[PDB]
Amino acid sequence: VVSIGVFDGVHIGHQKVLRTMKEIAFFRKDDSLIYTISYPPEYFLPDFPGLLMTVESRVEMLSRYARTVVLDFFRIKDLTPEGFVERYLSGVSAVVVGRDFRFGKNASGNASFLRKKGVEVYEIEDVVVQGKRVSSSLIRNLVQEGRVEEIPAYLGRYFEIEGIVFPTANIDRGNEKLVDLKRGVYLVRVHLPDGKKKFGVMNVGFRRNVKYEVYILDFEGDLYGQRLKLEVLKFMRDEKKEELKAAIDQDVKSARNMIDDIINSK
Amino acid sequence: VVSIGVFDGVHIGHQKVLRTMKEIAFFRKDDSLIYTISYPPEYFLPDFPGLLMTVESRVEMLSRYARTVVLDFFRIKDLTPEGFVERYLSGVSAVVVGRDFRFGKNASGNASFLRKKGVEVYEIEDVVVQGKRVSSSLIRNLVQEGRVEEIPAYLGRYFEIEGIVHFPTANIDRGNEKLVDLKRGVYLVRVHLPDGKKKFGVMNVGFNVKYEVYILDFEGDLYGQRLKLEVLKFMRDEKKFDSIEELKAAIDQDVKSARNMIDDIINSKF
Numbered sequence: 339v340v341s342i343g344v345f346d347g348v349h350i351g352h353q354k355v356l357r358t359m360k361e362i363a364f365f366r367k368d369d370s371l372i373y374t375i376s377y378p379p380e381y382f383l384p385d386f387p388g389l390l391m392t393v394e395s396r397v398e399m400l401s402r403y404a405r406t407v408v409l410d411f412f413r414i415k416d417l418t419p420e421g422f423v424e425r426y427l428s429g430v431s432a433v434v435v436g437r438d439f440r441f442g443k444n445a446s447g448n449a450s451f452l453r454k455k456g457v458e459v460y461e462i463e464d465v466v467v468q469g470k471r472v473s474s475s476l477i478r479n480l481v482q483e484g485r486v487e488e489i490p491a492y493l494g495r496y497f498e499i500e501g502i503v504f505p506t507a508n509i510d511r512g513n514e515k516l517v518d519l520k521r522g523v524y525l526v527r528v529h530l531p532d533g534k535k536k537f538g539v540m541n542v543g544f545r546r547n548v549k550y551e552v553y554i555l556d557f558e559g560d561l562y563g564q565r566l567k568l569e570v571l572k573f574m575r576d577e578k579k580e581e582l583k584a585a586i587d588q589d590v591k592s593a594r595n596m597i598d599d600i601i602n603s604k
Numbered sequence: 605v606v607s608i609g610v611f612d613g614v615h616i617g618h619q620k621v622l623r624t625m626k627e628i629a630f631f632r633k634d635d636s637l638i639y640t641i642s643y644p645p646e647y648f649l650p651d652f653p654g655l656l657m658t659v660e661s662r663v664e665m666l667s668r669y670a671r672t673v674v675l676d677f678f679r680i681k682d683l684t685p686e687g688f689v690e691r692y693l694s695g696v697s698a699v700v701v702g703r704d705f706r707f708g709k710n711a712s713g714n715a716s717f718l719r720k721k722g723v724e725v726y727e728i729e730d731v732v733v734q735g736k737r738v739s740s741s742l743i744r745n746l747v748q749e750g751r752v753e754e755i756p757a758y759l760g761r762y763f764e765i766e767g768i769v770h771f772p773t774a775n776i777d778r779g780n781e782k783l784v785d786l787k788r789g790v791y792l793v794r795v796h797l798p799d800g801k802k803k804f805g806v807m808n809v810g811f812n813v814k815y816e817v818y819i820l821d822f823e824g825d826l827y828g829q830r831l832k833l834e835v836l837k838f839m840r841d842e843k844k845f846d847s848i849e850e851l852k853a854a855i856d857q858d859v860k861s862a863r864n865m866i867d868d869i870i871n872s873k874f
């Protein structure tokens with residue numbers, strides 16, 4: 339059995355599709371395969387907010403469920419529905435996909451067409467959270483609106499910023515087109531290498547481009563070439579205008595405060 | 605520094621004005637304020653196309669530039685120049701306005717007057733695009749001719765239809781404002797849903813005018829929710845059908861051509 343989609347973020351509505359896949363694969367006495375389409379069609383249009391994560395990170399998470407295969411957008415956008423099935427679904431008796439699933443040139447290949455080729459299609463219904471249908475768009479919009487506290491209910495975890503490298507470690511997220519947080523300051527959990535975990539105050543601001551710098555608390559050292567994973571827990575204050583050190587001393591102050599708060603929350 | 609105008613549709617000329625206001629504000633180490641005048645006087649005269657957007661939408665955009673305050677045209681068209689300056693410009697060293705700026709009774713208030721009162725007034729040359737000066741009135745003209753593809757060059761983005769949602773098609777209620785009406789017909793639109801989700805759709809302008817949008821690859825109810833539609837391309841002229849089937853045939857057609865153009869757009873990026 340094969341599930342097919344982009345799965346950017348691998349939010350709870352995706353976890354739905356994938357848990358139903360494994361179930362279905364069990365009662366069909368079949369293997370499990372995840373086909374993750376590298377980029378959605380909108381990824382190319384000018385106003386795309388950007389992906390919640392790199393394709394590589396997404397694959398790491400998808401692989402936690404089943405063998406994962408990346409379908410290259412460039413390699414499949416031009417195929418006809420027939421060609422798609424012939425090249426990617428030979429010997430596949432069933433695919434699991436979200437509602438309104440489409441594929442092939444001009445989105446002419448749908449679940450209906452797949453059935454006409456004798457492939458059973460398990461159309462999974464969207465998961466709704468607080469009257470809203472979970473999705474990458476919705477979650478992508480919160481990231482932009484800096485509404486980070488509101489994310490878990492849709493993503494299954496805190497939105498993350500991942501990359502390399504008062505002082506402040508500048509996070510280079512890579513060359514993928516990733517979504518950007520509302521410019522401003524954030525309270526973040528920092529996963530350093532060696533399982534280490536420290537809190538941090540992260541500022542997000544211009545340089546078009548966006549920059550990610552974090553002041554990690556209770557930690558000197560340098561991560562210059564290392565990779566960091568940041569959990570964006572809370573939005574503190576919007577970006578500002580050299581009394582810098584002042585505010586970036588109260589952010590760090592408010593930080594300890596919220597942190598000691600979480601701690602007493604035994 | 606202060607910026608003054610109607611700013612219907614905040615086109616690129618309007619944006620030139622607002623950016624100038626911002627540079628001058630950054631320069632003098634002063635704050636910015638935009639006075640948007642609810643309606644142009646032509647709005648209350650015979651045969652006016654209608655705004656490109658509701659004052660509410662306009663203030664939403666302008667607001668992204670700086671503190672914005674709306675001024676009732678009726679509440680200031682009767683003031684005298686002095687009244688207006690006495691009422692809105694105290695302590696203001698500079699005003700930024702477009703061309704042919706006018707205010708007060710018998711449009712006797714102009715940039716000359718404001719200057720005399722000790723306030724510097726930078727008038728901005730209209731922006732020219734393809735040998736035409738950008739202007740709300742021009743853009744309103746494209747809309748009516750259905751020349752939606754040509755608009756971004758001037759407007760600075762696609763023309764939009766916004767409102768409440770009054771096979772499955774969403775009827776859009778634009779509101780009770782006098783909004784310019786698109787040429788009757790079928791259009792390709794980019795639907796901007798409530799969540800944050802973007803879906804293409806096929807819109808129909810038939811017959812006040814009625815706007816309907818068939819959203820592609822989407823299912824659910826939107827009664828009571830807002831929709832923002834980028835009107836991307838005019839596909840075909842509305843037609844009169846003498847057989848209920850010929851219509852569904854065509855509607856079926858439209859989404860078909862829609863999907864081809866949607867693919868074209870995506871592959872054009874390379």
Ligand SMILES: Cc1cc2nc3c(=O)[nH]c(=O)nc-3n(C[C@H](O)[C@H](O)[C@H](O)CO)c2cc1C
Nearest residue numbers: 504506523539541551553576577578579586589
């Ligand atoms: C916690 C924290 C908050 C910050 N907040 C801001 C800010 O509000 N505005 C700003 O211009 N720079 C801010 N910065 C500046 C940033 O570190 C860096 O010096 C600039 O981006 C360099 O152009 C902040 C840095 C930290 C560590």
Ligand SMILES: Cc1cc2nc3c(=O)[nH]c(=O)nc-3n(C[C@H](O)[C@H](O)[C@H](O)CO)c2cc1C
Nearest residue numbers: 773790806807808810816818842843844855858
């Ligand atoms: C894509 C699309 C195209 C349409 N084209 C027409 C048309 O050409 N002529 C017409 O009378 N109604 C047209 N309609 C109207 C619709 O089928 C129905 O008659 C009205 O909504 C009734 O108020 C269209 C609807 C859609 C979604």
